[PDB]
Amino acid sequence: GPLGSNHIPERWKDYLPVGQRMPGTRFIAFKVPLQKSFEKKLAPEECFSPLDLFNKIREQNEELGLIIDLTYTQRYYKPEDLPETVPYLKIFTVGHQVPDDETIFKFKHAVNGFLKENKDNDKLIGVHSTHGLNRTGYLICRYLIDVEGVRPDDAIELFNRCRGHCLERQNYIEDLQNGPIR
Ligand SMILES: [Cl-]
């Protein structure tokens, strides 16, 4: 049979696929869409493909202008397979430590480079990890705190309310609340 991993990440099925766009920002968070080979392991209602991602964005009357992918554990999809042409960036966010400073800067640079080129539209920066929750929430909130001067608890609350789930990792939360501006 074909070569290619296709295991469903632990807890992936448990999360709402796509959050609401965060008002006051151009962020939106989602869990990783899965390419076709994964679907052998899913019920139809559990599937969440790249097509489903774009459909759900459209349902909100929004449009992605950049995808930032934080994942590393498997090949989940190839950007060139996305059914809409959208700028893409991989930023590997590995393991469970607070994302390192290089990762934080690469995130900020990607966001800022997108914004500076899109001042006549409201296209979004879509950010995903596996669950679209922990690494995603951390980086979004770190951006808001550092770049926009948002109080950490206000960033976390906005992220949580829009995502549909609360940021879980306590070390991430603690760094947001008490760690340094990068
Ligand atoms: Cl991952």
Swiss-Prot record:
Disulfide bonds: none
Chief location of this protein within or outside the cell: nucleus
UniProt-annotated binding residues for substrate: T130, H131, G132, L133, N134, R135
Gene Ontology CC annotation, any one: nucleus
Domain Tyrosine-protein phosphatase positions: 38-182
Localization (cell): Nucleus; Nucleus speckle
Effect of H131A: Strongly decreases phosphatase activity with ATP and ADP
Enzyme Commission number(s): 3.1.3.-
EC class of the enzyme, as a word: hydrolase
Subunit-structure text: Monomer. May interact with SFRS7 and SFRS9/SRP30C.
Function, in words: Possesses RNA 5'-triphosphatase and diphosphatase activities, but displays a poor protein-tyrosine phosphatase activity. In addition, has phosphatase activity with ATP, ADP and O-methylfluorescein phosphate (in vitro). Binds to RNA. May participate in nuclear mRNA metabolism.
Protein name as it appears in the record: RNA/RNP complex-1-interacting phosphatase
Phylogenetic placement of the source organism: Eukaryota, Metazoa, Chordata, Craniata, Vertebrata
Residues shown, of full length: 29 to 205 of 330
